[PDB]
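the three lines:
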Amino acid sequence: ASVYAWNRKRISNCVADYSVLYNFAPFFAFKCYGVSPTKLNDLCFTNVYA
Amino acid sequence: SALGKLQDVVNHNAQALNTLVKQLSSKFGAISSVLNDILSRLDPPEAEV
Amino acid sequence: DSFVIRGNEVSQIAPGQTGNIADYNYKLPDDFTGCVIAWNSNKLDSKVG
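prediction for all of em together
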């Protein structure tokens, strides 16, 4: 979607693994504020949005 | 309140320790107050500061 | 020390800094001292196919 109508999708109630994301997209920038990605594979969250 | 002085000594000390324990909850600017999360959700380079 | 790496990982080459390049691939100590150098080289190491 375009910026002025960004799209939001709720993802919950599932086992999330953030190790598969390295695949898709050369990923010019992948950075986090408040967590560090190598440790991101461990914690449990409230409600993650995309 | 005939024994005001002795009772007051006890309360001053108890209150000092109590506030010292309560002050552990303050964050002082860190992203969280308990050490476990900081060491859990962050890499060592940022966890230092 | 010499080797060849990707173009989105330069930040990853640091003491104990997270990405996927400095945890299990090859890692430097947490007290590192020195300098790091990287240069994208696509004119001598990348062929057609």
